[PDB]
Design an enzyme around this catalytic site. Structure first.
Site, PDB file in Angstrom:
ATOM      1  N   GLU A 159       0.808  -1.197   0.000  1.00 32.67           N
ATOM      2  CA  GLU A 159       0.000   0.000   0.000  1.00 32.67           C
ATOM      3  C   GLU A 159       0.847   1.255   0.000  1.00 32.67           C
ATOM      4  O   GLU A 159       0.340   2.339  -0.254  1.00 32.67           O
ATOM      5  CB  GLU A 159      -0.921  -0.027   1.210  1.00 32.67           C
ATOM      6  CG  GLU A 159      -1.999  -1.049   1.037  1.00 32.67           C
ATOM      7  CD  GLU A 159      -2.870  -0.730  -0.156  1.00 32.67           C
ATOM      8  OE1 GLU A 159      -3.541   0.328  -0.148  1.00 32.67           O
ATOM      9  OE2 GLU A 159      -2.878  -1.530  -1.108  1.00 32.67           O
TER      10      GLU A 159
HETATM   11  C1  LIG Z   1     -12.887   3.251  -6.174  1.00 29.24           C
HETATM   12  C2  LIG Z   1     -11.810   2.232  -5.823  1.00 29.24           C
HETATM   13  O1  LIG Z   1     -11.115   1.727  -6.707  1.00 29.24           O
HETATM   14  N1  LIG Z   1     -11.681   1.929  -4.539  1.00 29.24           N
HETATM   15  C3  LIG Z   1     -10.816   0.839  -4.146  1.00 29.24           C
HETATM   16  C4  LIG Z   1     -11.261   0.309  -2.804  1.00 29.24           C
HETATM   17  O2  LIG Z   1     -12.524  -0.314  -2.970  1.00 29.24           O
HETATM   18  C5  LIG Z   1     -10.264  -0.702  -2.246  1.00 29.24           C
HETATM   19  O3  LIG Z   1     -10.599  -0.994  -0.884  1.00 29.24           O
HETATM   20  C6  LIG Z   1     -11.214  -2.208  -0.658  1.00 29.24           C
HETATM   21  O4  LIG Z   1     -12.487  -2.196  -1.308  1.00 29.24           O
HETATM   22  C7  LIG Z   1     -13.127  -3.482  -1.267  1.00 29.24           C
HETATM   23  C8  LIG Z   1     -14.425  -3.352  -2.031  1.00 29.24           C
HETATM   24  O5  LIG Z   1     -15.179  -2.247  -1.543  1.00 29.24           O
HETATM   25  C9  LIG Z   1     -13.375  -3.891   0.192  1.00 29.24           C
HETATM   26  O6  LIG Z   1     -13.854  -5.243   0.202  1.00 29.24           O
HETATM   27  C10 LIG Z   1     -14.855  -5.510   1.101  1.00 29.24           C
HETATM   28  O7  LIG Z   1     -14.231  -5.744   2.358  1.00 29.24           O
HETATM   29  C11 LIG Z   1     -15.162  -5.974   3.425  1.00 29.24           C
HETATM   30  C12 LIG Z   1     -14.336  -6.325   4.638  1.00 29.24           C
HETATM   31  O8  LIG Z   1     -14.364  -5.255   5.556  1.00 29.24           O
HETATM   32  C13 LIG Z   1     -16.107  -7.110   3.079  1.00 29.24           C
HETATM   33  O9  LIG Z   1     -17.152  -7.140   4.039  1.00 29.24           O
HETATM   34  C14 LIG Z   1     -17.279  -8.310   4.736  1.00 29.24           C
HETATM   35  O10 LIG Z   1     -17.642  -9.330   3.801  1.00 29.24           O
HETATM   36  C15 LIG Z   1     -17.787 -10.636   4.399  1.00 29.24           C
HETATM   37  C16 LIG Z   1     -18.307 -11.565   3.314  1.00 29.24           C
HETATM   38  O11 LIG Z   1     -17.241 -12.282   2.709  1.00 29.24           O
HETATM   39  C17 LIG Z   1     -18.734 -10.588   5.605  1.00 29.24           C
HETATM   40  O12 LIG Z   1     -18.557 -11.776   6.355  1.00 29.24           O
HETATM   41  C18 LIG Z   1     -19.639 -12.604   6.471  1.00 29.24           C
HETATM   42  O13 LIG Z   1     -20.580 -11.989   7.362  1.00 29.24           O
HETATM   43  C19 LIG Z   1     -21.795 -12.764   7.513  1.00 29.24           C
HETATM   44  C20 LIG Z   1     -22.707 -12.005   8.468  1.00 29.24           C
HETATM   45  O14 LIG Z   1     -23.539 -11.081   7.780  1.00 29.24           O
HETATM   46  C21 LIG Z   1     -21.479 -14.189   8.027  1.00 29.24           C
HETATM   47  O15 LIG Z   1     -22.664 -14.986   7.879  1.00 29.24           O
HETATM   48  C22 LIG Z   1     -23.031 -15.802   8.923  1.00 29.24           C
HETATM   49  O16 LIG Z   1     -22.049 -16.834   9.022  1.00 29.24           O
HETATM   50  C23 LIG Z   1     -22.364 -17.801  10.033  1.00 29.24           C
HETATM   51  C24 LIG Z   1     -21.098 -18.577  10.315  1.00 29.24           C
HETATM   52  O17 LIG Z   1     -19.998 -17.681  10.428  1.00 29.24           O
HETATM   53  C25 LIG Z   1     -23.594 -18.572   9.585  1.00 29.24           C
HETATM   54  O18 LIG Z   1     -23.906 -19.634  10.466  1.00 29.24           O
HETATM   55  C26 LIG Z   1     -24.736 -17.566   9.566  1.00 29.24           C
HETATM   56  O19 LIG Z   1     -25.907 -18.223   9.123  1.00 29.24           O
HETATM   57  C27 LIG Z   1     -24.394 -16.389   8.614  1.00 29.24           C
HETATM   58  N2  LIG Z   1     -25.379 -15.332   8.701  1.00 29.24           N
HETATM   59  C28 LIG Z   1     -25.832 -14.775   7.589  1.00 29.24           C
HETATM   60  C29 LIG Z   1     -26.751 -13.576   7.738  1.00 29.24           C
HETATM   61  O20 LIG Z   1     -25.532 -15.191   6.474  1.00 29.24           O
HETATM   62  C30 LIG Z   1     -20.321 -14.875   7.263  1.00 29.24           C
HETATM   63  O21 LIG Z   1     -19.840 -15.973   8.026  1.00 29.24           O
HETATM   64  C31 LIG Z   1     -19.152 -13.928   7.032  1.00 29.24           C
HETATM   65  N3  LIG Z   1     -18.179 -14.522   6.128  1.00 29.24           N
HETATM   66  C32 LIG Z   1     -16.879 -14.382   6.377  1.00 29.24           C
HETATM   67  C33 LIG Z   1     -15.891 -15.213   5.567  1.00 29.24           C
HETATM   68  O22 LIG Z   1     -16.457 -13.623   7.247  1.00 29.24           O
HETATM   69  C34 LIG Z   1     -18.482  -9.430   6.548  1.00 29.24           C
HETATM   70  O23 LIG Z   1     -19.570  -9.334   7.461  1.00 29.24           O
HETATM   71  C35 LIG Z   1     -18.372  -8.144   5.766  1.00 29.24           C
HETATM   72  N4  LIG Z   1     -18.082  -7.025   6.642  1.00 29.24           N
HETATM   73  C36 LIG Z   1     -18.454  -5.793   6.295  1.00 29.24           C
HETATM   74  C37 LIG Z   1     -17.925  -4.637   7.139  1.00 29.24           C
HETATM   75  O24 LIG Z   1     -19.193  -5.558   5.330  1.00 29.24           O
HETATM   76  C38 LIG Z   1     -16.717  -6.992   1.694  1.00 29.24           C
HETATM   77  O25 LIG Z   1     -17.373  -8.206   1.372  1.00 29.24           O
HETATM   78  C39 LIG Z   1     -15.625  -6.751   0.677  1.00 29.24           C
HETATM   79  N5  LIG Z   1     -16.190  -6.592  -0.650  1.00 29.24           N
HETATM   80  C40 LIG Z   1     -15.633  -7.219  -1.688  1.00 29.24           C
HETATM   81  C41 LIG Z   1     -16.299  -7.068  -3.052  1.00 29.24           C
HETATM   82  O26 LIG Z   1     -14.614  -7.905  -1.581  1.00 29.24           O
HETATM   83  C42 LIG Z   1     -12.095  -3.768   1.061  1.00 29.24           C
HETATM   84  O27 LIG Z   1     -12.437  -3.888   2.433  1.00 29.24           O
HETATM   85  C43 LIG Z   1     -11.405  -2.418   0.837  1.00 29.24           C
HETATM   86  N6  LIG Z   1     -10.128  -2.367   1.534  1.00 29.24           N
HETATM   87  C44 LIG Z   1      -9.779  -1.277   2.221  1.00 29.24           C
HETATM   88  C45 LIG Z   1      -8.392  -1.228   2.860  1.00 29.24           C
HETATM   89  O28 LIG Z   1     -10.536  -0.314   2.363  1.00 29.24           O
HETATM   90  C46 LIG Z   1      -8.832  -0.184  -2.312  1.00 29.24           C
HETATM   91  C47 LIG Z   1      -7.845  -1.273  -1.942  1.00 29.24           C
HETATM   92  O29 LIG Z   1      -6.495  -0.827  -2.003  1.00 29.24           O
HETATM   93  O30 LIG Z   1      -8.540   0.243  -3.654  1.00 29.24           O
HETATM   94  C48 LIG Z   1      -9.382   1.326  -4.047  1.00 29.24           C
HETATM   95  O31 LIG Z   1      -8.959   1.788  -5.275  1.00 29.24           O
END
Ligand SMILES: CC(=O)N[C@@H]1[C@@H](O)[C@H](O[C@@H]2O[C@H](CO)[C@@H](O[C@@H]3O[C@H](CO)[C@@H](O[C@@H]4O[C@H](CO)[C@@H](O[C@@H]5O[C@H](CO)[C@@H](O[C@@H]6O[C@H](CO)[C@@H](O)[C@H](O)[C@H]6NC(C)=O)[C@H](O)[C@H]5NC(C)=O)[C@H](O)[C@H]4NC(C)=O)[C@H](O)[C@H]3NC(C)=O)[C@H](O)[C@H]2NC(C)=O)[C@@H](CO)O[C@H]1O
Length: 154
Positions: free
Chosen positions: A19
């Site tokens: 980064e």
């Molecule tokens: C303009 C531009 O170019 N911008 C760029 C910029 O975007 C970049 O930064 C990065 O961006 C990306 C995309 O926006 C970001 O990616 C996102 O990251 C977040 C993490 O913080 C992700 O959010 C999490 O997603 C996971 C899903 O995989 C969620 O986890 C799940 O949560 C559910 C609960 O709701 C769990 O379900 C339950 O599970 C139990 C068992 O565990 C089960 O029994 C239950 O039944 C079940 N319940 C339900 C309701 O289903 C589930 O287990 C769990 N799964 C896991 C594996 O954990 C989690 O809750 C989310 N958290 C949040 C907060 O939302 C998001 O998915 C992800 N998006 C993508 C597309 O990947 C990234 O964070 C960001 N990085 C930074 C540093 O900001 C930058 C990068 O350099 O570049 C820019 O240019």
């Protein structure tokens, strides 16, 4: 709040460099913890700088702190994890939660760092496969920096 072991401490540093917040070139009062995207710095840590830095004419970013955390996720995770300040402590807390979410902690823990990087490719743009059109470090050079952060691979 995720437990920090050394694999994770290294994935973090590797990310800090990938980064470019803790990459030696970038000026910094701490270790990228005060680095804002674009290169400017912040001095108050009670919270995310929430400074929208214009990088190029056609693109902008909120990315700040060591892992260039978009503020969006900062708010998400600080609330999720009851993080008081944006101290480096809180900054790591987040990095690791995302990492854990990518289910790459077992991977980071076990050195499958390409697998982790590829697993975390959607978290940071400087990682290969990220697909954010950002300058993506070759996977090899990330593994490299990671290794020099103290992390272990393979
Ligand atoms: C303009 C531009 O170019 N911008 C760029 C910029 O975007 C970049 O930064 C990065 O961006 C990306 C995309 O926006 C970001 O990616 C996102 O990251 C977040 C993490 O913080 C992700 O959010 C999490 O997603 C996971 C899903 O995989 C969620 O986890 C799940 O949560 C559910 C609960 O709701 C769990 O379900 C339950 O599970 C139990 C068992 O565990 C089960 O029994 C239950 O039944 C079940 N319940 C339900 C309701 O289903 C589930 O287990 C769990 N799964 C896991 C594996 O954990 C989690 O809750 C989310 N958290 C949040 C907060 O939302 C998001 O998915 C992800 N998006 C993508 C597309 O990947 C990234 O964070 C960001 N990085 C930074 C540093 O900001 C930058 C990068 O350099 O570049 C820019 O240019």
């Amino acid at each position: 709040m995720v437990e920090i072991n050394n694999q994770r401490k290294a994935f973090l540093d590797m990310l800090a460099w990938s980064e470019g917040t803790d990459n030696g070139r970038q000026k910094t009062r701490n270790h990228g913890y005060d680095v804002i995207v674009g290169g400017e710095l912040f001095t108050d840590y009670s919270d995310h700088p929430r400074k929208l830095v214009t990088l190029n004419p056609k693109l902008k970013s909120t990315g700040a702190g060591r892992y260039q955390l978009l503020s969006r996720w900062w708010d998400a995770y600080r609330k999720q994890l009851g993080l008081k300040d944006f101290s480096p402590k809180s900054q790591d807390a987040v990095a690791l939660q995302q990492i854990k979410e990518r289910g790459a902690l077992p991977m980071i823990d076990r050195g499958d760092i390409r697998q982790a990087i590829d697993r975390c490719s959607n978290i940071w743009a400087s990682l290969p496969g990220a697909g954010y059109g950002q300058f993506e470090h070759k996977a090899d050079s990330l593994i490299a920096k990671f290794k020099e952060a103290g992390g272990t691979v393979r």
